[model samples]
Every structure is written in structure tokens, then in C-alpha cells.
Target: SMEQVAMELRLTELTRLLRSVLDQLQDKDPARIFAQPVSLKEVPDYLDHIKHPMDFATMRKRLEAQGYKNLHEFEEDFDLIIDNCMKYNARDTVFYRAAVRLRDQGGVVLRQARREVDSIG
Candidate 1:
């Protein structure tokens, strides 16, 4: 029971940190472009261009499912979201610029998380 309680506490902290990171990115994306998984119907060449697609919705699902073991895993998915967008969109495009912004802002959040959570771990 004590171990279970400790586990829950750790999970709760992780959840909080991950949610803040997600919220930050979602807020940055006012157009909700990265809020959901990419649809083949919406962009026929999306899957063709992106080998592995990651999105805010999918990350939310993973967080709900307790899929991440630690902050690093969450960070990886965060990076993947940016990576996928940059890879699919052109350098001169708005989407690519959005991804770049996410990368920049997300970096600050992630560093704060690492200092707060990873250091504790």
C-alpha cells in the first residue's frame, strides 16, 4: 500500500508536468493544426511525407493511458510532434514555422520539467 501510494504520487507529478507541456504547445497552436492526428483525407500526401506522425491528441491519449514511464518519454513524443510537422511541411510554409516555434517554446517548458521532475527522479 505504501509503494502504491508512492507510485501514485510520482505519476501525479509526471501527469501535471506533461499536461503543462501539452497545454503550452496547444496554446501556441491557436489554429488547432497540431491538436489532432493528421487525416489522410485532409492531406493526401501527409502520410507519404511523414513516416511517423505525432499529435497533441495522440499524446493526450498516451498520457491518459499512463503510457510514458518518465519525463524523457514524454519529451520524445513532444519532439516527435515537432519533427513530424517540420518534415512534412516546407521550410517556407506556415506549418513549418509553427513547428519551429513549438520547438523553441517547448524547449523551455521541457527544460523546466527536467529540472523539476528529472532531477527529482
Candidate 2:
């Protein structure tokens, strides 16, 4: 339940942050908009380390065993990179593209995740 709550919070915060940035960007360069790349690859690492704020060799080993050999390989899967200088790290760019790539895919993911929480409740 805590994980679900945390995920919901993260999703909400990330969405809000993204929307705010996009609102600003729309008034400016709609094209060639730059954003920091927050690699999903970095996420696993960040969670294992920073989220826990712990030094666990087991986490490192487990990640390695799962075949996450390099961050570069994971980076390729993402279409947009979050520009650190930008507000939302380009998550909006990815979200927008995802919506285009598979009509309502982004919304579906969010809605489904929310549904799961509601079901539990």
C-alpha cells in the first residue's frame, strides 16, 4: 500500500512538474525545445542507492544479475532525454510522444495504475 501511495505521489508530482514546464515551453519554442534527460536507466540506480540512501552490495549484484549491464543500453529505449536544466527533464516530451505513438497509451497507464489502487481500497 505504501508503495502504491508513493508511486501515486511520484506520478502526480512528475505530471504536475511536466505540465508546468510544457506550459512555459509552449509560449516559447514549440519546436526544438530542450529538456534534461532523466534516463530511466538511472532510476533503478537512484532507487537502489539514493532512495534507500544505503550502500548495499546485494542491490548492486541483483541489478547486475538482471542484465542491466550498462546505463547506455537502457537509455536507447527512451525517446526523449530529460534535460537537467529544464524543469521536468523532458518527461512531457516523452509522454506526448507516447500518446501519439499509441493513442491514449499514457493515459491508460496512469488510469490503470490508479485503478489498481482503487481496487485495493
Candidate 3:
């Protein structure tokens, strides 16, 4: 029947929604600080605090590779990126504050996507 085709349509819609979320999140990171990986040599103790590291570049690769199954999973990685930054850097540091702002701005995008996708469903 058309049920399976309908499911695929839903998946495509969700994928587009997730991609938009990433774009909006990147816009929030105007300084490009979260654009790439955090250097281990510069901050040798970073791994000691944040075990799971994530950044925009890696996230995009994962997305393009179709690694993300759902929007929730995408949001999880987004949160991981922010959490890693805040945990590894001190509150007074720019990185930490940037993470906080990203979390706030990025969170709004994620939440809005969730609401919009739910409507589509």
C-alpha cells in the first residue's frame, strides 16, 4: 500500500528539518569557535574532563553520511558539543560562554523544529 511510501516522505521531511537546525545552530556560533575541533595539544587536559567531543564539522560529516536516524539523535549530538565545551573550559573563558550562548540559541532552533515536525507528522 501507500503506507511505506508515506513513511519515507516523513523521513525526508525530518531530514530537511534536521539540516535546517544545524544551519541555524551554526549561525548562532558567529565566531566560528565551534566550527572545528578543539586542539588537544593546546589543552592537554580537555579529554580528561570531556570524554565525548563534538563540533560542527564532524556533525555535518555525520549528517551527510546519513549517520543520524532521527532529529532527536541530531539534537543529542548538538547538546554533546555544547556540554563538552562548557565542561572542558572554565566559566570565565570565552569558550565556556560561547557554549552557553550556543546552547540557548541552538536550543530554540531545535525546539522549534520539534514543534514544526510534530505538526508535519
Candidate 4:
């Protein structure tokens, strides 16, 4: 089927792009991975988006405490407001957790500043 062929091609591409990081990361951060159904492209983009480009380490430290959560429980406007960590200079750990739950396999996500930790050091 067309979809199957496309899927294979995407996987091939992912193999290369992900290889650089995959080789460096040994463990997944969440300690748990949800791999039933997820878009391969979305997760990487999510990790990158959380960096808030040029936001600086000072900002990232603040972003960590937000404990990104899944808005699956988003009930009212408050849910949206409270979960809006970026607005408050933070990142939602729960949302990140929710995202990993969608992964087809387990993997750790390295933040921008800390990407050096996994080096040959």
C-alpha cells in the first residue's frame, strides 16, 4: 500500500537523523515509554520546541519545575491556563510525559544545554 511505502521511507530517514542522538543516549528519562501510536516527527519537534530557542539556561532552569503534564484532563480555561508553562516561563513535564507515552519505543530526551553531558566525557 502507499501508506506502507511512505512509512518505510520515513523510518529510513528517521534512522539517520535519530542515529546521532540514539547512539549517545543510553536511557530514557521518563523511565517508562508508551509506544502504541505516535507520530515520529512530532516528538523530536516537541523536545526542540521546549528549548525555547535562545531562551538561555536561566530560563530553562525555570522551565524544568513546570513538570510538563498531559492536558488530557484539561477541563476548563484554568486547565489551559495552568498548563500553559511557556507563558509563565516554564515547560510542562506532564505534557512531556504524555508525549513519551505515545512513543513506539523508549528513549531519553536530552535538553539543549545538557546535550553535552552524554559526550565522551
Candidate 5:
């Protein structure tokens, strides 16, 4: 159950990230213009290019491949990436339902992942 929840939450986060990237690319203004919107379906194909794996070991390997010997160094960069991505993708919604849905779903996934990890250790 925990694994399933975590997987779903991970998928949702991936979807949010993809949407954020698309939003950035779709920006068009007189002062500044970004690239055209990339199709949502193409996200999975772009995953390899982004270099972050959801699995902890794979993530460690990715960092090692990038010459980051210390895990903390990789974590620092990853946090920055997440922070910037969320800031760029921040949305404004008049309805509370959408926020509630996101929060509840995310909390479920996070709790599930933590339980599974703790059980394993």
C-alpha cells in the first residue's frame, strides 16, 4: 500500500514538474519570450536527460557519475533544483478543492514512503 501510494505521488510530482517546465517554455511577452510549449506526452522521454532518478541508490549513482563524491553536495543541488522548479511553476487558483487534492494526495504518498523506508531499515 505504501509503495503504491508513493508511486502515485511520485507520478503526480513528475506531472507537476512537467507542467511547470511547459509553462516556462510557453511564456511570451514583449520584453521576454520563452520557447514554445512542449507536449505533455513527451515528458517520460525527457526523464533520462534530466539526470535525476526517483530511487535513492540510482540518485546516488547519478551524482557519482557527475563527479559529486559527497552525497550532501548532490542533495544541495537537488534542493536548489526543486526550489527553483516549484517557484517557476507556482500557480494561483481561486478554488480550494484543487489545493486540497494536491495536499492530501502528496501527504499520503509521503507518509507511505516513510513507512516503507522505516520498515526496511
Candidate 6:
């Protein structure tokens, strides 16, 4: 099962890179592209990811004016988008759940440092 998990993770990485590059498809290679079309799956599986965050102030203003909230609602939402670009060529887009792990022993490290300082004192 762990091997299968590793395989899936690798595949997801390959898919993210491939999708983003193809999103950059341009007119320079159409003839070759037409001759040799392929599918990493032609159909998209995920929502379009926003590679860059939107103008937060503008979005906040708009959401404030038009979005709704309720006391009963407890859900928060966020999505991660990745694009491999540029002003002239940053047009490719792909969406996937990137496995991001952030691990830290904040208290342990701090306590250790404080102990060392106390010993020195």
C-alpha cells in the first residue's frame, strides 16, 4: 500500500507538470501537434487553478458587498492553483492538490534553547 501511495504521488507530480506545459500550447507547433496528439487524458479532472492570487483588496470589497454568511455556516474555503509561467507567455494552468507538509517542533525547540541558556547562566 505504501508503494502504491508513492506511485500515485509521483504520477500526480508528472500530471501537474504536463498539464501546466500544455496549457502553454501555441501556434508554433500545431502541425506536429496535430500529427501526434496524445492524452495524459484529454479531459480535465480538476478545476482551473489560479496560479496567482487575485487582487485581495478588490476581491474582499466585492465579496463583502455581495457574498453571504450565516451563523450556522462553519465552512471555510480555499483552493490552490499552479501555473508555470509571464506577461507574454504565462498562459498555462492546471489544478491539483499539492501535498504540502509543514512540520515543526516549535515548543520543543524553544524549550531546548531556553534550557541551554539557563545552563549557561
In the range 1-121, model 4's lDDT, one tens digit per residue, is 9998976655544344333433233133233222121233654554443333221122223223322121121112112222333332334566444433422232233342134332411
- List TM-score per model, in order: 0.87, 0.26, 0.86, 0.22, 0.26, 0.23
| Backbone clashes in model 3 | 0
Candidate 3 segments whose C-alpha is farther than 4 A from its true place? 1-9
- Tens-digit lDDT string for candidate 2 (24-47): 332332332322322446655533
Which digits, one per residue and each the tens of the lDDT, describe model 6 over residues 1-121?
9998976665554344323322222222222321131222562421243233322232234334433131111011111101211121233521111111100122233345345434643
Return the top candidate by lDDT: 3
**lDDT by residue for model 3 over 1-121, one digit each (tens)?**
6998887767777777777888999999999999998888888887787788899999999887667778788988998899888877799999899999999887778788888877877
lDDT of candidate model 6 versus the reference: 0.28
Give the poorly placed runs of model 5, Cα more than 4 Å off. 1-82, 93-103
The TM-score obtained by model 4 is 0.22
Error in Å for residue 68 of model 5: 13
Best by TM-score: 1
Query: Clashing residue pairs in candidate 1, if any?
Result: none
Better of 5 and 6 by lDDT: 5
lDDT of 5 by residue, 7-81 (tens): 666555544433332233222111221112223385555444434322223333443344443324533443433
| Cα lDDT computed for each candidate against the true fold | 0.84, 0.35, 0.85, 0.32, 0.37, 0.28
For model 1, residues 75-108, the per-residue Cα lDDT tens digits are 7888888988888878999889989987887777
Please give the clash total of every predicted structure, in order.
0, 9, 0, 8, 0, 0
In candidate 4, position 45 carries an lDDT of: 52
Cα deviation of 52, candidate 3, in Å:
0.9
Q: Sorted on lDDT, highest at the top, how do the candidates line up?
A: 3, 1, 5, 2, 4, 6
Model 1: ten consecutive residues of lowest lDDT? 105-114
